[PDB]
């Protein structure tokens, strides 16, 4: 019956008979046509859907602004609220807001897909803190992920708001005017001013939603519908219904009930209301710890600590305290701390008040200790600590911030009296079972004992007995979890045996000098410097080549006006396509049952391989009789809406029959015929006879998800004449989309056109699978004579799409005692997934050499078919894998030689003039110069001894340092692959329209082409415009990949402009002072054509793989990278302190864009080598929930200090304006972090007496780090027999 | 091309021109329409000369394409257009032309 | 370079789809831009003749 | 199946433009009153030369 009234961007919104299942993110985009708020992941993780919620409190008479993720907000909970969106704060047609201006002009957008989310986080903080500190801004951005920029640009923009040659003019930014901000809509203030008691009701066929606005009403609805969930923030229930198949027919969702918002400062503690957000609790507790004595604020410190790392700011401002406590997540960070602190819950029912303790039995949901079905949590009591009462909280995860815990803990002690006899003890752990667990029996046995090391040894063992983990346990990481449990117990000992020394120094002993670093955690600050050339006096001041010109679409990224593929409006009567994918790794499809699915609401069609017949293949789209991996396409469900399609897809019943063998690993794939790729240089077998030492070793390397922020997206629109299709798709290869769609429809290419304006990141993962999906989508569209849209959710996308190839490298190395590798016999193995990969092996081998001359070399490679998602090409294209393995070989030799890796790197380096394994002459002057400048700027030698100084002084924390050189050759297989084309029109007003085969993915290609046009035609960039990329305008264009897009399309764009000048030479000479409008007009008047095709034939390139020699590369991008880290030997955490990068780029066409490519590549590499990890079960299922969640780098992961230098220009008359195409280059430089961690672990291994075989694999995770730092805790843990259990992973 | 189909059958005549000049069936040629995004600065479709003048421009483009493909066509006289186009791409010869 | 005009076919013209067509398109595009919306203008036969 | 301009599908949220035309051959426009017209259902805007 009730109406849903709220505001969005100042404008009233009324929905009558509203569906209560409607979420805000869909509503904004589809119903309000506000497409700036984006879909990234759909679980609150990435912050792409960040918005501002505003509410008036009629009691306190103040407007409260908080951030939130729109993907989890149900619109029925917005009654009387004011949503603000990226569009709301400014636009190009109104006026640009400063946050929008600065994030763009600081070059903080590349692909731009994360920009609106960043803007709304920044904007929201500024509305609460107009004069902020940088900490407050970076804390707000804790939940905001970016895959392109590396964060530094966004942090520079944040600094401009903080009181305290460049890429951007900070002084030119208009100042923030807090008095001229958006007024909170006055009507909502009037609505709140009358405290209506009317309980609101919304409904549909599926759901009934009750919003009680009083406590009396709330309890009345809790009696009626006892099993209905009380929705507050929807950050627990929301993700469960979204992808754990849960459904609630009745929802109770109360408004701000004053009893649930209580903040009572009691005599013996405080009572916090169940409706308070976690962010509000953090403020309340941060306030009291600053104004009460430390003796009483012990519990509030522990909660503060874990609230600092709990998700990001968006989830904290949504999630409620009561919701946290009641939802009882096993990996809850707060509940273990609450468990140990004698906290009690204030319950309330219709039939009265009640109070129960928050104990292990409550956390394990024992009915007699739980809430009754008819009652609610009103508030929680958290008492003040007494004298000699101490509490600590610990946690470890994949990264420091915005990531679920692997293990966490709360631990309390009580001594009383003052002596050292322990009188109470509660020790709770999370992430080690289905619920939070208290070691009640261990603690009972420890009562009466003293606080000494003899307690620890026994306390560790009976804890290890009590908190048992089966080797098959959910989450995996069993051996690591075991260690963390006792390693936190060790840290707790040290914290307590220190506050005791502080308070009572004569009785208790001082800590061991080397041990003290265990207590301080690894915090952060973000410093950076950017060196580059700035030509110059010779050049015309309006020539834009060399200048740091902002990305053309950058401000539109900031305002949300940039249209990405799904942002295209609803086409009349369009349908939606979604796929049923395989749930088995290698099985026979015995049957499919579409009966229930076909009958369901909105369903137009469901296609199997049968229904595609002879057009189910290219150069198979849907599975036929067998499946060969999880995530393979099986059915295509077509419906009138997205929800209807997803619903019907879940009721498609497929039954399988598993098949042997189930091949998952590379070793398993090695047991018909694979083609070999080989490089022979010198004579390896004779070299092995004349070397001081021989060394065998290997390293495995994990894959990598692309994690483009824009998921796979397309709109396929049939014209309704001559079977014409228009295909709008986020892809890197329009020509391939054209071909596969045309082929599928059995049409000539002239009927199918593919159009691409922009792609929200790609990195290689928007090519082959994109076309398969576009082919299937276009089949449906043609079949039903309707436009069809296919956009994948993040889970589907990661499963359906591939990743980077996992590698295995095997090497046998002969070397001298000074560290010269005179013989090397290399083997590469790529994990291909279900299909072939060999392109990647080839580039692996050709770029394997990197910075080093290997005078006798035998490099061999083989792609390996497994039953996992079919992996694709990735930014780096074999080099990140092939380079790491040679550095691994170098590091193992260094160890045997007693020399540092950097001495072995410099002794094996290519000389100024030298030759590659494939007989190409190279000028490695800039390789050497990059290495030297990187040693100098980083002050390597001085920091080297500072790290050795630290390591000799610290036992439980170590630092490490590494430097790595870069040679990234650029060049495709052949001349035809590197050809490119453009089309340039000059209109009679003098304005220019240009286009070309290249695709904007965030790399700023289109910006560079306008810079090229500006130079060549001698006109401002404002006078040139580009719409996008199309097969209708420029045919037969090659893939946008290989670090050469701007490089090659730039030459074609140049070619077109020069053709136009040749024609206009007569016109220009007769009127030198004339404008372009005059020249264009007088050209038309004299019948001179003002349209021209541009063309570049391509770089000459060849490779004879029989002989193993050729000229495949046009030029070489050189560099070096130094990185420093500190590790936590107890937990396995690490911090990246500093990273210095020097890079030969030739003459940069745009140093803002080119520096942005280095940072992005570097951070994408850093992730690959450290924190990015895909977990697969023994049955080939990808794990995607809990601590198994996949984590790209965040702001917390970004190096604290970052220096980037570009080497002065080098003159290369074979490329566009002597520039070098980077983009892929910097990825490998992130292994500097890998080897810095490798060094740090070696320091702990040397001190402790652990010599010999140190092979750490990539990704170098906290699991791998901590288990490498062996000690009494690693040797102590329980261990299972290898084959006695089935593991969760590997 | 810059010309507009008003019912006078201009587009039909341009495909007839393309069919003669490239020596291919009319079924192998397609036209979608007219656009300032593809062909700039086009004069009015009037004066009894639309097909007349746009036909000469369409002819001009086809001949430009043959000049480039003359090497390709002589080495393989029996070949199809698919073969000639493919081998043109393989040898970095442009297959787009203004008329 | 910001404005593109696309024409697939015309259902007869004979000279009468030039100057007034552009006037109407100019006015129509002013509205579309003003309100940030697609705008369609199709005349009835009486209006058209007048 | 031949698509003419008005045969193009409804674009999402598109508006419609129609003209008020002159009913006199040579006269002065002493005034225009858009008051009733502006208040009526669906009306987004009415433009004069102003
Ligand atoms: C992206 C993301 C990251 C996260 N990261 C972390 C992390 O790092 N660490 C961590 O510890 N947690 C994390 N969480 C979990 C989060 O803290 C909880 O989901 C949240 O605290 C639950 O609060 P809520 O208000 O959303 O509960 P809701 O989803 O609204 O409700 C959950 C349950 O509690 C019940 N309930 C709620 N209020 C009451 C009441 N007053 N009386 C009775 N029953 C009630 C409901 O009936 C329901 O069954 C994360 C969640 C997300 C989505
Ligand atoms: C590669 S040097 C270069 C690069 C960009 C521009 C430029 C020169 N000129 C020359 C002025 C020309 C002379 C020829 C016809 C058009 N008029 C404007 C400008 C001068 C002043 C403002 C903007 C520009 S744009
Ligand atoms: C102006 S003479 C003219 C006009 C139209 C066609 C034509 C000749 N040819 C030549 C065959 C060419 C030879 C060159 C390459 C392509 N093959 C088909 C045809 C023969 C048979 C069927 C259709 C056609 S299309
Ligand atoms: N922001 C952004 N940068 C990116 C990519 C991307 O998808 N987004 N892709 C990379 C890849 S894999 C390649 S091959 C190059 C291609 O463009 P370029 O040749 O102009 O550098 O861009 C790189 N940089
Ligand atoms: N069916 C049809 N035929 C038509 C017209 C038309 O609108 N429809 N316009 C005429 C006019 S006024 C001119 S100028 C010519 C232009 O086309 P052409 O030069 O190709 O004949 O077509 C003539 N024939
Ligand atoms: C198909 C898929 C990926 C590719 C990456 N780089 N070059 C060519 C490719 C062809
Ligand atoms: O060539 Mo980039 O898409 S791996
Ligand atoms: O030239 Mo025809 O439109 S009178
Ligand atoms: S946070 Fe909602 S889209 Fe990723
Ligand atoms: S620009 Fe931030 S995700 Fe691409």
UniProtKB/Swiss-Prot annotation, chain C:
Homodimer. It is found in: Cytoplasm. Mo-molybdopterin binds at residues 13-14. This is Aldehyde oxidase. AOX genes evolved from a xanthine oxidoreductase ancestral precursor via a series of gene duplication and suppression/deletion events. Different animal species contain a different complement of AOX genes encoding an equivalent number of AOX isoenzymes. In mammals, the two extremes are represented by certain rodents such as mice and rats, which are endowed with 4 AOX genes, and by humans, whose genome is characterized by a single active gene. Oxidase with broad substrate specificity, oxidizing aromatic azaheterocycles, such as N1-methylnicotinamide, N-methylphthalazinium and phthalazine, as well as aldehydes, such as benzaldehyde, retinal, pyridoxal, and vanillin. Plays a key role in the metabolism of xenobiotics and drugs containing aromatic azaheterocyclic substituents. Participates in the bioactivation of prodrugs such as famciclovir, catalyzing the oxidation step from 6-deoxypenciclovir to penciclovir, which is a potent antiviral agent. Is probably involved in the regulation of reactive oxygen species homeostasis. Belongs to the xanthine dehydrogenase family. It comes from the Eukaryota. Induction: In liver, is down-regulated by adiponectin and by the PPARA agonist, fenofibric acid. Abundant in liver, expressed in adipose tissue and at lower levels in lung, skeletal muscle, pancreas. In contrast to mice, no significant gender difference in AOX1 expression level (at protein level). The gene is AOX1.
């Amino acid at each position: 019956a009730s109406e849903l009234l709220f505001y969005v961007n100042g404008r009233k919104v009324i929905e009558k008979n509203v569906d209560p299942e409607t979420m805000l993110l869909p509503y904004l985009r589809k119903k309000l046509r506000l497409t700036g708020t984006k879909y990234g992941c759909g679980g609150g993780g990435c912050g792409a859907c960040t918005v501002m919620i505003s509410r008036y409190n009629p009691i306190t008479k103040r407007i409260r602004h908080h951030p939130a993720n729109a993907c989890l907000i149900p619109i029925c909970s917005l009654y009387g609220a004011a949503v603000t969106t990226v569009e709301g704060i400014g636009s190009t047609h109104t006026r640009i807001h400063p946050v929008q201006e600065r994030i763009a002009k600081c070059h903080g957008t590349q692909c731009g897909f994360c920009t609106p989310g960043m803007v709304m986080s920044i904007y929201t903080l500024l509305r609460n803190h107009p004069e902020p500190t940088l900490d407050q801004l970076t804390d707000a951005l804790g939940g905001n992920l970016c895959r392109c920029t590396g964060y530094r640009p966004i942090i520079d923009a944040c600094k401009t708001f903080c009181k305290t040659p460049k890429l951007f003019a900070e002084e030119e930014f208009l100042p923030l005017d807090p008095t001229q901000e958006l007024i909170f809509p006055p009507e909502l203030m009037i609505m709140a001013e009358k405290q209506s008691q009317r309980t609101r009701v919304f409904g549909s066929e599926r759901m009934m939603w009750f919003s009680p606005v009083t406590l009396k009403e709330l309890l009345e609805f809790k009696f009626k519908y006892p099993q209905a969930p009380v929705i507050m923030g929807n950050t627990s229930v929301g993700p469960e219904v979204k992808f754990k198949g849960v459904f609630h027919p009745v929802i109770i969702s109360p408004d701000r009930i004053e009893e649930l918002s209580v903040v009572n400062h009691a005599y013996n503690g405080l009572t916090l209301g169940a409706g308070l957000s976690l962010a509000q609790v953090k403020d309340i507790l941060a306030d009291v710890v600053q104004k009460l004595p430390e003796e009483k604020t012990q519990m509030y410190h522990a909660l503060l600590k874990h609230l600092g790392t709990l998700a990001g700011s968006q989830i904290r401002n949504m999630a409620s305290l009561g919701g946290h406590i009641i939802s009882r997540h096993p990996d809850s960070d707060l509940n273990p701390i609450l468990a140990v602190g004698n906290c009690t819950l204030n319950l309330l029912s219709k039939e009265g008040k009640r109070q129960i303790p928050l104990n292990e039995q409550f956390l394990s949901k024992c009915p007699n200790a739980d809430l009754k079905p008819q009652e609610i949590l009103v508030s929680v009591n958290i008492p003040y600590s007494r004298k000699w009462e101490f509490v600590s909280a610990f946690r470890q995860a994949q990264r420091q911030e915005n990531a679920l815990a692997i293990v966490n803990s709360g631990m309390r002690v009580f001594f009383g009296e003052g002596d050292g006899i322990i009188r109470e003890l509660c020790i709770s752990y999370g992430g080690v079972g289905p619920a939070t667990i208290c070691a009640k029996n261990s603690c009972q046995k420890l009562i009466g004992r003293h606080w000494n090391e003899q307690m620890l040894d026994i306390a560790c063992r009976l804890i290890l007995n009590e908190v048992s983990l089966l080797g098959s346990a959910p989450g995996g990481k069993v051996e690591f979890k075991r260690t963390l449990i006792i390693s936190f117990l060790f840290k707790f000992y040290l914290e307590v045996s220190q506050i005791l020394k502080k308070m009572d120094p004569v009785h208790y002993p001082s800590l061991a000098d080397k041990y003290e670093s265990a207590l301080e955690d690894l915090h952060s600050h973000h410093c950076s410097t950017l060196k580059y050339q700035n030509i110059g006096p010779k050049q015309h001041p309006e020539d834009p080549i060399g200048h740091p010109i902002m990305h053309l679409s950058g401000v539109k990224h900031a305002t949300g006006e940039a249209i990405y593929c799904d942002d295209m409006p609803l086409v009349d009567q369009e349908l939606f396509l979604t796929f049923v994918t395989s749930s088995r790794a290698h099985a026979k499809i015995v049957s499919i049952d579409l009966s229930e699915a076909l009958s369901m609401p909105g369903v137009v069609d469901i296609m199997t391989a049968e229904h595609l017949s002879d057009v189910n293949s290219f150069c198979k789209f849907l599975a036929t009789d067998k499946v060969f991996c999880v995530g393979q396409l099986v059915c295509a469900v077509l419906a009138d809406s997205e929800v209807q399609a997803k619903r019907a897809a879940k009721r498609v019943k497929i039954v399988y029959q598993d098949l042997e063998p189930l091949i998952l690993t590379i070793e398993e794939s090695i047991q018909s015929f694979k083609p070999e790729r080989k490089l022979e240089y010198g004579n390896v077998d004779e070299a092995f006879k004349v070397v001081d030492q021989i060394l065998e070793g290997e390293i495995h390397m994990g894959g990598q998800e692309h994690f483009y922020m824009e998921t796979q997206s397309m709109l396929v629109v049939p014209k309704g004449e001559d079977q014409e299709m228009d295909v709008y798709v986020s892809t890197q290869f329009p020509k391939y989309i054209q071909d596969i769609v045309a082929s599928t429809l059995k049409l000539p290419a002239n009927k199918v056109m593919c159009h691409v304006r922009r792609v929200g990141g790609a990195f290689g993962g928007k090519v082959l699978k994109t076309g398969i999906i576009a082919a299937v989508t276009a089949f449906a569209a043609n079949k039903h004579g309707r436009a069809v849209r296919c956009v994948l959710e993040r889970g589907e996308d990661m499963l359906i799409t591939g990743g980077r190839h996992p590698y295995l490298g095997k090497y046998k190395a002969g070397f001298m005692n000074d560290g010269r590798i005179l013989a090397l016999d290399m083997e590469h193995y790529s994990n291909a997934g279900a299909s072939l990969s060999l392109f990647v092996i080839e580039m692996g081998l050709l770029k394997m050499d990197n910075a080093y001359k290997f005078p006798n070399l035998r490099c061999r490679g083989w792609a390996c078919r497994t039953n996992l998602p079919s992996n694709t090409a990735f930014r780096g294209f074999g080099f990140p894998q092939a380079a790491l393995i040679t550095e691994s070989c170098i590091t193992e030799v260094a160890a045997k030689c007693g020399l540092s890796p950097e001495k072995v790197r410099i002794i094996n380096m290519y000389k100024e003039i030298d030759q590659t394994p494939y007989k190409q002459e190279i000028n490695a002057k800039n390789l050497i110069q990059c290495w030297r400048e990187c040693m100098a700027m980083s002050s390597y030698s001085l920091r080297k001894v500072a790290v050795e100084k630290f390591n000799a002084e610290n036992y439980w924390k170590k630092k490490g340092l590494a430097m790595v050189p870069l040679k990234f050759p650029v060049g495709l297989g052949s001349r035809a692959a590197g050809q490119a084309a453009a089309l340039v029109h000059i209109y009679l007003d003098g304005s220019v329209l240009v286009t070309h085969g290249g695709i904007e993915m965030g790399q700023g290609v289109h910006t560079k082409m306008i810079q090229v046009v500006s130079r060549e035609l001698r006109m401002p960039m404002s006078n040139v415009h580009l719409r996008g990329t199309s097969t209708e305008t420029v045919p037969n264009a090659n893939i946008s990949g290989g670090s050469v897009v701007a490089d090659l399309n730039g030459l074609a764009v140049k070619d077109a402009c020069q053709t136009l000048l040749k024609r206009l030479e007569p016109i220009i000479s007769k009127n030198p002072k004339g404008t372009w409008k005059d020249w264009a007009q007088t050209a038309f008047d004299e019948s001179i054509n003002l349209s021209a095709v541009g063309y570049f034939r391509g770089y000459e390139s060849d490779m004879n793989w029989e002989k193993g020699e050729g000229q495949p590369f046009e030029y070489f991008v050189y560099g070096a990278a130094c990185s420093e880290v500190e590790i936590d030997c107890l937990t396995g955490d690490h911090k990246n302190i500093r990273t210095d990068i020097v890079m030969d780029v030739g003459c940069s066409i745009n140093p803002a864009i080119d520096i942005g490519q280095i940072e992005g590549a570097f951070i994408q590499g850093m992730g690959l080598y450290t924190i990015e990890e895909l977990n697969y079960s023994p049955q080939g299922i990808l794990h995607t929930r809990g601590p198994d969640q996949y984590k790209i780098p965040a702001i917390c992961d970004m190096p604290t200090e970052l220096h980037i230098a570009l080497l002065p220009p080098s003159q290369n008359s074979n490329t566009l304006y002597s520039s070098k195409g980077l983009g892929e280059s910097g990825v490998f430089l992130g292994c500097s972090v890998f080897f810095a961690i490798h060094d740090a672990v070696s320091a702990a291994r040397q001190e402790r007496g652990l010599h010999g075989p140190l092979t750490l694999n990539s990704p170098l995770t906290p699991e791998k780090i901590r288990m490498a730092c062996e000690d009494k805790f690693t040797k102590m843990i329980p261990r299972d027999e290898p084959g006695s259990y089935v593991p969760w992973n590997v």
